[model samples]
Target: KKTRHYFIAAVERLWDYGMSSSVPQFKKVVFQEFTDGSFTQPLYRGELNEHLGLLGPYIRAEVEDNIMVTFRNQASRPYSFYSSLISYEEDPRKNFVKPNETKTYFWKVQHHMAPTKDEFDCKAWAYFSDVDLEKDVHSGLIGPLLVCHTNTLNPAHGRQVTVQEFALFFTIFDETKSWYFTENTFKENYRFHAINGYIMDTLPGLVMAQDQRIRWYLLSMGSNENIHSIHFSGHVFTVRKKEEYKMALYNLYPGVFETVEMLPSKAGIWRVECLIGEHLHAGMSTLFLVYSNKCQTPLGMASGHIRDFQITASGQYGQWAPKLARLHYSGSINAWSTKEPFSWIKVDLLAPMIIHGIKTQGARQKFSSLYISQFIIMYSLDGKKWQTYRGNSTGTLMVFFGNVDSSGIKHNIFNPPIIARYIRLHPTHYSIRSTLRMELMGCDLNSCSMPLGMESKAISDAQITASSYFTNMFATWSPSKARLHLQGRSNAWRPQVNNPKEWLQVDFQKTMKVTGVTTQGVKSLLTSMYVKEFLISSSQDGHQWTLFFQNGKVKVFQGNQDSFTPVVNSLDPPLLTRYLRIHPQSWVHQIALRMEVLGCEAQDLY
Candidate 1:
């Protein structure tokens, strides 16, 4: 009975767009403002940012197949006035809903979000069921919903500040008040240190992806908050098996308010160590004695901290506490444990040497023997891989590349080097008596030395830009890219076009609206050499590439340069790419570089 049970199967993807040919049909209607009855009164419009303000907006589309069809706003502006999927009463046939039919949709909208002046536009598009899975193809998929921007409140809260966001009343739940769950790893889509939040928030509702992660970020408005959770409950299922919980609040700043911490009781046990704390709640009161009950949501001064001496079944509570009906945007950072009688859980910084410096202030010696199982710490080099430390130690633990220590007075400190981005201490491990103290030190910002062969600069409107080559053999970088496009010098090159050694590249005026970048070499009798690396970047200025995509060999910076440059939410992904550089960062001397941009159909967004 000592055999391990493992399941293996290739995930079979079934085609499910109902019937391909029997898709829905609808017509596009249009309405212009500032003139006739169609003109939306501009008096109430809000200030504008990336979205359009309040106004009468007309739409138009073609009626192809009439059925139980769906509609979506393809434009970039808020279609808040009155956008709908309708049928004319006169001389028209009714559309029926087939059991299962597939269709695609696309639309564009413009917004006017200026303060002194008024008027803006926006566009949105939707697609259904199946789509082309090719790597670099364009897809003209139609959406199955309509967005109405009806929020006309004062945009600035003072004079007026207009903010435009997409509204999706489309992706509704067919069921009643049900609940759904999801999980995912945090991915940084914007530029380094970019202030914008996650991308999932802007989506119609909430989404939980693989890795037990849920995201709440976006730049849109109008869609109901409760709808996302309600629909998910009605149409989704949850996986409940033997499991443990490891969660954190991710990146924390001066004003980060209420947060929940979930940790495992012990190594491999389906138990969790939970902690709750308060920070800043908008429109919220701080002092409980003078707490204003009427101020359901109040803003408080940004100074608060909470630590747990012990776990209580009565967990720290919040007004918006975790509830059955609402899906809390939380996910597991990472989990690891040791065998019984575990003295310590060591942190092994595999690479990136982010393990650089140590510093700490306060101390906590509350547990019986300092719980190695109930500690928690959240750290971020860039908030991308937000590591959470949940184990306790015997000394003052601070920051540094090596030798971590947690400040402890009476306890015998055996282990050395305790500094980590995150750490957690639990109470389930030891039955003996020992006092543990906490301390912080060695924690300071240490600048990264530039590698040889590459230059660094700030791209236009970019925050920071530092580029360099891998001076040593077998070095690693963040993100991952498949290839790099080269620019600047093609001189001192190879005579034969077939030679891989002779390389070339071109820069762009801005982020190229690209389908995908491709490469080709002259098919000579000579063997083709292996390409070592390539990268893509987006920047206002060419001197610095905000995005960085580099894997073991190839790299593309498209996803990283989300900040500074405006990311196009095209029905088609940014397949309209313009510029990239192919740095032979390091390739075999014999291997020459040759690549091209294959202009193709922009398929679904990647």
Candidate 2:
């Protein structure tokens, strides 16, 4: 029920189709997010959204709410606000704004356009200028819009709740339609398969955390050739609609928008491409990364895992090794000092960390005054590609005020934390002698096995099976009842034959890593049973089998001693397979037990 106001302007700017490097530069009229009606300064996104090519300030509104778009045509042409979900009936004559003119379009969100109860949390709309229809959009006047339910977005941050969202405007931008098309110098069929507004692996900011709730919005604009086969590599998502469908490819075409949800299980850099022959030929592809923070706990200098060798510097004094640059290194070598100007210190975190802040201490000596007056930070995911941190407002390399003196600690927290495995810092301005010691603050990103669907019922009953079961008056011997912590008559499934051979199997549907399992013995008035010792085996097709091995031998797991008490064991080296089996080697009374599988989807690993 809140009202949101957005200031937008249609301005002509020089754009490089290859992100100012690959392709030729051209004149394009695009939307600019502004601070206010004066339109003196443009509103830029924070670090989290900076790379999201100039399309959105990501205007969003909720049902029953009103979004007032005060648009000014600063460009030398006629253009106005046009939309999908809502309409502006303020007269078509008044719709198009002349150059240097201004118009205000009030788009009121109605429940009709709001996401259905079973649909995605937010619904996306394609918004652009329609003065010249195709020509206006092709000139880069279109952007993303969102309309949703009451709680879909957090009013404070203008971001969705419980979800990390990204909007992708995929189009074969037919620059041939640009009213300023002739100015481009480039000829017809000057179609660029673009995502957002950039092409050629240029669209960035599509990053997410492992197992984080994410929503991807797809917007398509163009004519018949607008068919875009968008594929998300290393991950698959669920389509939240009348019925849920899982797919990796979310195909799109002109005038359509689609939104899908994902909980990225796998970690690492992944590709997102529009798999059309010409689209790929036209640079319609990019990469997104899903980082899995290893340690839930704080990492870095304090973790004891980061070694001296991981710390490297441009230069160091005779006795001042780069290893002396640890946050709390207390050796006589107070800190590491570079031999000359234009020096830097880099640290390989060993693993990715969502760095929140950095702490620094300058070289301290009883007789010397040394400290950095200002500094800059740069980071990289794989060290091959690097990006520097900059002030959002200043739009320049972000400089941090260093320590006042050599002994004091100077902590500078990233407004929007950085995600990187390698961090490099350079002292831009320093005292007579520039030296340093620093610590990165953040948790590690690691992928570990988590309890699969047993207790949560994400793994269906049909997925659980056994060679044979001993049934009682109650459902005590049903394989479907063998869920961890399950109780009552169907507390566990007991095999008819006490086994050195009987096996319980689980079908994961798709391939998954069988990392470990937890077993619980059943204890009740009816019977008492426990699996004392067991071995695990796996098969990809459920026909061929291989035993879980360690050091060239089948590994046996020790199970629970007392009924009702659960015992857990993880595989030293997990197995990747579609089906998993547990063979009870030794049992007390009978193999009556509840169990749960531990692991994660392995499709991404391949």
Candidate 3:
């Protein structure tokens, strides 16, 4: 679409809005982007004025659309506009506009500019002053631009539709690099490390509930001093397009842009801040609260009334036999016991409640101990049809341990709280007798925290492109070891060769919303040898794969091959895929890896 370009006259003004309101207004030159000779409300976000304080209005367009931008400088000094990612003509005369002069330029969004095909729906770019890079940016002539695929843009609003979308620019606005450096030096000066033009607690407009999905577009622009490693509290998030979970932090170099997605599971206030010492103390942090729509209260341990309790099979002893009173340490019989083999105990609550967890303890006796070696937990609403409780879909609720000393109290927490009024504890094996003294721990449905995908199952089928047959590298290394990686155990997979173009792929069996992946190095070796550079990709079917980290880009995660700390790589904007592949392009030494694909089932909120 051919259209006329709009420009603005750049002027210096003393801006003391929020960043150090105690001090006098600092001089800043900002670009006020307008559409076809217009400067009005609704075009720009927040408070509207001729003097655009820190950044310009957000501009977004679709692919294959011919766009024009005109610049008319009204200030006494000369400045020019330059696009960061979007391609444009480089004619010096047209690019450089004089003082009080105007110039227009054209840009075309093509497919070749996309970092990856899957991310073609949206991309982030920027526009800044080209004349003096350092001074222009420090003076605050910057704004964000989003390019989208055709038909993805909102025709009515001319913007992209998003799910709880937010945009932020983190930077240390160094006034010393401004055109008015002399005037700024005369007064007490300090770097304004801020987010979205506001510093620390002063930053506003970031609040959501625990049930919502949020997308954050984080852009960092400035000199080298602006680099930051952002860390979020309360919840972990995944980077865009990468199928993985990046625990609570990610690094951002100057001029780098990243999009991340978060599923707020816990209800509480959280903070986002730069981890750098100087940046954190300089107030490069903001707060956001994730409130719950409903409230829940724990009532399982509140009362002494057990609605219904009975033994599936009674023991021979009359005094120490299975009794409801013996379920607690409140007194003797001392403990509840049923006949060995095919025996169980059941209890009913005062009311149906959402169960958070269950705590079990063996009977407290003199010198020895008696604990349930294997048990299964089942719950029911009407006591007719029972639903078995499991750690995951594959297995049942397991208590105790394979080793000795299983007498201590043990707790098992459910990710998504189970709702039931009746509960049954069936002990398959025990040290002395089939006995248990337990308490159900939980709250009402309204108080339970949402699940964070820790219980999601792993893909069972896995393979590799090539393997080295030397030094314990057999055909079974890829199949057997790859199977163990998802078991949440200590086992890992590694190749003897350190050559390029090696890859590991896993099939999830079905499509799932993948958040990201976490990789650990081989545990057997002490020497550091891990994948230095790699790309993550996903596919709905095994045939056509789309690269998550594309454009010849790979991430280097440095660590000791024997370390326990796993590195997590997350996908921004979660996607549903059946297959995922990790391509190791280079390595620190020999190729070796242990990885877990992370994701959660998209449960219905209502």
Candidate 4:
């Protein structure tokens, strides 16, 4: 019988070896992995590398997901040493568990689309499920094997065929436990090619979506102890000489856990068989030998639309292209029944959008006009089915005070910027006098802010309104109490620190003008009480701003600093907008406020 053919669709590899195993002209890939310690603790992710094979432009990895690492090895040899790696659970003192000797360990890894926070935190134990590490190592079989890349298509020329091997490559360390290489260069010596897949032009008109399931059987003889044949659609995709049948994502991947489904582009009848010795874990995992043509179906549009208020009132706001989304509530909410579950107003979207953020007004209180906090933001791709973005979706509805504009607009600046989609205001607990009213400004998801741009803290409850925004830009009281929290533009939920005093930063995506500032915090310093007034200010140019502070007694203390987070409310009346900043004038931990502009029609303030 003649062999079937599959156009090169997509292929991936983890450790190595897929290179040398490639049928010349074709290249392979290596997966970069990250690991931290806890369940909620995630192993960080690294970038994808694709420059090993001789074919540079022709051969490469078009990565779709961040990456899923199964810190285990896939070695069938129970006795001999198979070089692999292990992930140790929270001992709190170390990263992973190293075996005493060498042993054969097996693990799997799959790359799936993960959330912004990283998905490893949800399923962290995938690396070392239930392997007798001591026994395997005592027998000299230990190594890391991964099913990194899946779905490979090697285009053929006439009667020519190419054979590809998918397996784990080892990274041997020195006897002293020191790595064999200084700069993670041990990747050059690894080698293995256990699994293989081939594509020929015998059949035509086929495309597999990826992870298409197939019915497979494992047959045994007399004692039912060993397996005889592994068959799928009939014809064997694997050779009949091997004792064990390795089921992989196509023949390109090492981990069988990684599954592929047939794309809507497939057409034709396909069969597969895996002939192997009995009792071994081997069988055909997929049936359809679907053909693949390199035509793209625009995975649907993912357009994003952002506005300041619930209704699309007239204004020119930036086109919010959000990778993530959130909804924030202002200082207060007074309603007859905090019962209006936030509703969605339909707007034409060009992209696949998800409602990822939901926040409420200050703390919720019964009969206090701000009790019912939070709204449930939901979405439907087809406009009929709805789903909500979990995790970080429920933001805190903090109520303090900032400056208000003439039209009753309460302004607050969110640092460590947030990229939000549709916000659902679920009125949970709230004060009953005022409705959940909110006006958004500078809500630009595409703001070019980087991490760690602004730093802040509270000095006293005596914070002045620099100039109120919202409704009253000049309404000042003798007493204003609030705290402040400084956020870096790139600050994620889990912050990583290089030094005790140095944290990450928030970077602006582009250059913009600067303007007013406003804050709410303590203002008095009493005797016998340990007090620290660290008055800090933000400015366009550091020199001029710092100089102003030094001469004007507004300077608290000085040290190494990054750029300033602009104070949108403190600028003179004609608030020249752009660049935002926040600096600590004191030591208070947290505060939330809005900076008001006299009449600055900042771009995207629609």
Candidate 5:
């Protein structure tokens, strides 16, 4: 029913992980959201939303809608925008953006993306960069996505207001593996087992009132180190029930994204943290503040009759005013009659809270059954741009099923509820004229429109090189195509003439803080080949290479057993130099190499 537009840019900055020198952390590339096309009017993402930290802007939508992200790579290197929830293609035109370049990526919420019948009213997804998964993620590029049931969110806030909703990204941030690690690591493997991008005392706004409905949409990313188990100290949350079971903890792994609902009964500053030994020590923790407040009773005037307002109708008959429209109220002018077939009643609530809906009784006594049988509801905030309410399921103007006979009350609750200072009742089919007695139903609107919570570079091809290739251009096993986790036609690199010294390498062209390296084997019908073991070496001018050593012993890396699966290895203390290589020591059949280097690659930025 709508298309949401977002303007975001990939920006680079010196990020402080926690400390302020030998104190500051790493520099990084992150996604920054803007309010409009101007790109300067930065939209307020709410106090709670600021917890997004290194994550991208929170994108929201309904079952069937479109989200278009106008992205500009303002960073020093290439980057792209992506969504796992919205529909998108695999084309580079929709995936990559060169530095300083801007492009729009389009996505749509298809029917199948909607929540299942037993699922929550809304579901969560993720959006992030893929130009280089590990590097991009560590460089800080990820965000939350919500595609809910039809008409599930309050249009005013673009979220479900009945509850306090927020997003929690609990993943291990390997700062050492980040693209900005060049100056980031002072010879230390820095990691933040944190939420969003904040550690212990840093995440913002986890406050709420007792009994308030709260939803936490959680997301996690990275390698095996990213898995976590959250322990809530003073309260509990339901990730969905087995027996409507009461639980207080949950587990998470990389790529997991879902919501957990909670209603606090305890009013206290409670501890919410990851139970893992290392993660806890690394600072994956925060507080959820639950305070006390009064939950008000319904404020609508229909069922209980409050905030009485003026009711005007098209062609009122027998009475100058229609006070009899109040349900159950009887008068000598027992009922009001319309002088025209095209009739309507405009009830000026004068206060636009959440308009629950209306209840009407056909003209009393004067003729009970002679009443409007089908009707349409329209509302306006300023009484200028009136919007008609329709059936969410059908997306068509809904003629609500009205009273069957006089004195018989027919009340239909607005499925997701609505907000309107001015409510209009347009008659469609009437037993007689559009004569009736009615009262509106609603509650304080403030409750539902509340707060909550909730980039990078890729390496270019020309930078990678190999000792040799088994074939030529058409189906060549070349180093340029060795991007980790990437698939290519030639599969992997093979030396024209194999040798134990055969190796694959990447020249950052500039010194980078290297933390990790990944390698993949080759797959072909003729031979499923791979390197069984390898040695790492580095150099400054690409000559006079120095083999990496730890404990004064040559470091040997475990490679692959099969021809497919890629293996990852992290450099503990890390290194700082220009050229890095992976030398194959042994092989399954022959020497075949494919790889990607992880670290902070140097680049100029705005």
Candidate 6:
């Protein structure tokens, strides 16, 4: 099936970094997604205004899908979308456009573009104005365009399936290149370093659950002036299934793009920021939260036991047989022996796991001399091929027993978990003479859960307003408390005393796919107010509403006794809207509301 994308070229004054009051109005040219044939989508309504404040909407197309874009210019000046990085017949006549004119561009995405049969997704490309290349880009007339493999279009029908995908663009925005250059004469001219036109935590709609296989497509544009070092916190990433530790500081120069796959194992808010000194100092950063309802259990002693493992040496000896490699000895003392220099022991796991880290414990008292002093840990998907576990910039993966004592136990944790079926420990140096015996520590893959691809529809840092709230000196049960609940914190939102009619509403800033919601009641020891009967509703325009939970039709939530615990309510078919509100009809004492809106981006579904 063919996929068609739409955009409308428009010009409007926009702000950057909330600098509207100081920085002169930026007459920016941007391509916005056409909500309908008539282009009726609301113009410049929320956090980032239309043109410069926001980069254009992401345009996606599959390699096999026929892609066409009908560009209509709504700006006062002439503008055109020049597909700079894609393969297609160049049309000289379509290079420029006059006001009130429209043009259509066709991208066949031919076989030549698909360089290799095995590689489905082509490198990312962009659409920018060629009328004045430098001025156009500086004016914010640019955005990302992705061409995926055919299989990525329909996951169920395709061999190459993608769980989740995110695209990011890095650029050093030069405000001087804009059409309104004279407006910033007095300004410091600090080249706006941003990720997709948004600096810091202002970038919206970035939400993912823990353990989700995420595909990140990173692209950089501009001259050498734009240098980016993407330093993702709390997780490491793999490029082509190989763990990248040293290269964790993703260096993205101009006109370069890199794709990395990552499984977010940690559950907390993580920051993805630029490490380049000047870039970071200029405010290029964003936050992504990994939340999970399910608790994670440690992957314990299942894969490295003697029953499921095999030990080998340069040559076998009496007491150091492979069968004694288990953590617990049989009836008497049992240990594995190997020679000095190049002795190695390989452990075969019952199943493959994305290993977070490993622990090694050498034999105790009597076999103190057998404790390993120096060793190298490596893993492999297949037993035949092995890759050394390179540590991060800090060199954590390198193994060294500081002061080799009788207790030779060392533990190493992988920032971004590693996937392997077999783990091999190669001892380089010995403690005393020439022998070593040890046991491995790791958890099975089943112990850890993968992210469910569920994301928060409500903007975490967005403004929240409600009908009423309880106020006090230490804490005020205000509307903001509603979002605190999503962070897994016990911040109850209670309405003013005796307020029978109470309501809480969250503004997502823009339309999003709201799948379900989780709610919690008041946890105050002074009062036991909890929402007993409520009405959940959604709205796009905010004036008109659609009821999700009615008075008697929907069952009331059996509010938890402990305020820390939350009750989840699932929406059968997700709702598409920009606003969600909860109206409390009845309560144990007084009306109060705390909830989490769970849903991914509106276009997240494959």
Task: Please report the candidate that would top lDDT against the real structure.
Answer: 2
Q: Give per-residue CA lDDT, model 3, range 457-476, as digits (tens).
A: 23333333334422443323
Arranged by TM-score, best first: 2, 5, 6, 3, 4, 1
Better of 1 and 2 by TM-score: 2
Per-residue alpha-carbon lDDT of candidate 4 for residues 1-606, written as tens digits (9 for 90 to 100): 112211111112322222211222212311112223121222221101111121111111112312123232222222221122322234225232232222222222224321122211111111211234333211122222221222322223211112211111111111122121123233342222112221111111121212332211111111122222333342223211223243332321122222221122232235433334321222222223332212111111111123222232112113321111112332223212223333222222322322112222322343332323333323333434443432211122222242122123233332211123332223333233123333222212112111112222222222232222122253222112122233223111111111112111111233333332223222222211111222333344322332224444544432211122222222222223233334433322222221111112234322
User: lDDT (CA) for every model shown?
Assistant: 0.22, 0.76, 0.58, 0.24, 0.69, 0.59
Give lDDT for model 5: 0.69
Residue 525, candidate 1: how far off, in angstroms? 3.4
Q: After superposition, how far is residue 153 of candidate 6 from its true place, in Å?
A: 1.5
Which residue pairs come into collision in candidate 5? 21-24, 141-455, 161-448, 179-600, 301-306, 325-438, 368-406
TM-score of each: 0.17, 0.61, 0.44, 0.22, 0.47, 0.45
Q: Candidate 3 or 4, higher lDDT?
A: 3
Per-residue lDDT of model 1, residues 530-578, tens digit only: 3344344444444454443333423432221211111111112343333
Stretches off by above 4 angstroms in model 2 are 17-23, 85-93, 182-189, 295-325, 331-333, 336-436, 441-606
List model 2 lDDT by residue over 52-79, tens digit each.
5758567788888898899899988788
User: How does candidate 1 fare on TM-score?
Assistant: 0.17
Is candidate 2 or 6 superior in lDDT? 2
Model 5, position 568: C-alpha lDDT score = 58
Q: In lDDT terms, how accurate is model 6?
A: 0.59
Question: Model 3, which residues run further than 4 Å from truth?
Answer: 1-11, 17-22, 35-53, 89-94, 182-188, 207-212, 241-247, 291-606
Give the count of colliding residue pairs in each prediction.
169, 8, 15, 151, 7, 2
User: Candidate 6, which segments miss by more than 4 Å at Cα?
Assistant: 19-25, 42-53, 85-94, 115-122, 155-162, 182-187, 240-246, 293-606
Q: How close is candidate 2 to the true structure, as a TM-score?
A: 0.61
Q: What lDDT score goes with residue 236 in model 2?
A: 85
lDDT of 3 at 402: 17
